[PDB]
Design an enzyme around this catalytic site. Structure first.
Site, short mmCIF file in Angstrom:
data_model
loop_
_atom_site.label_atom_id
_atom_site.label_comp_id
_atom_site.label_asym_id
_atom_site.label_seq_id
_atom_site.Cartn_x
_atom_site.Cartn_y
_atom_site.Cartn_z
N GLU A 167 68.82 94.97 14.63
CA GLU A 167 70.05 94.19 14.51
C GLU A 167 70.63 94.19 13.10
O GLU A 167 71.85 94.23 12.92
CB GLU A 167 69.78 92.73 14.90
CG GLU A 167 69.29 92.54 16.32
CD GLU A 167 70.34 92.91 17.36
OE1 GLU A 167 71.53 93.08 16.99
OE2 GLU A 167 69.96 93.02 18.55
N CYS A 203 81.62 93.79 17.21
CA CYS A 203 81.03 94.92 17.92
C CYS A 203 82.00 95.37 19.02
O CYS A 203 82.97 94.67 19.28
CB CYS A 203 79.65 94.55 18.47
SG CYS A 203 78.35 94.61 17.21
#
Length: 178
Positions: free
Chosen positions: A34, A43
């Protein structure tokens, strides 16, 4: 400068709290996948992200505490641990397998580990990874981690890499270390 936060520091806090079971290697695996960010980012299929892959309680332009980002991470980890415990016999498997499974559930969500849509059968059916988990067959379970590498029906290099890191963790202590 500073916008990127320290995974290692987040790990010590979360482990210190004494709630999560997943071990150092598992938290390292999840954290590095991550990354760690105090500034919310976008994203694809854009929904804002915080800290270490957190998407809950996220407000653009709002920079979080070091402790708040660990709090957030903890919460998301425990959800993934609940999945493994409720649905994959987590309580019966060793720590390395449990931690690898938790990483998978953190990333893919519980539902995608439990069943998949069979186009042949025209319905969702139990996964092999769940079958082997319920049988307490940890090595076989671990070795199905690479089944879960698709996003929107397309395999990702990154998910191949991730599932393989998880598989290697899962299996350490279960097979000859060499």
């Amino acid at each position: 400068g500073g916008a990127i936060c320290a995974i290692a520091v987040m790990i010590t806090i979360v482990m210190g709290n004494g709630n999560v079971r997943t071990n150092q290697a598992g938290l390292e695996l999840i954290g590095n996948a991550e990354g760690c960010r105090r500034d919310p980012y976008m994203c694809p299929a854009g929904v804002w992200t915080d800290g270490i892959g957190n998407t809950h309680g996220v407000t653009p332009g709002v920079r979080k505490t070091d402790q708040q980002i660990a709090a957030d991470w903890e919460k998301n980890i425990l959800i993934a641990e609940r999945c493994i415990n409720q649905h994959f016999r987590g309580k019966d498997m060793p720590d390395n397998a449990f931690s690898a499974m938790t990483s998978a559930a953190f990333n893919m969500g519980c539902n995608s580990l439990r069943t998949y849509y069979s186009k042949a059968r025209g319905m969702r059916v139990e996964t092999s990874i769940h079958k082997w988990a319920q049988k307490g067959e940890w090595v076989n379970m671990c070795n199905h981690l690479p089944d879960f590498v698709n996003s929107n029906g397309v395999p990702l290099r990154g998910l191949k890499i991730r599932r393989e890191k998880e598989r290697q963790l899962c299996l350490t202590g279960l097979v000859n270390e060499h």
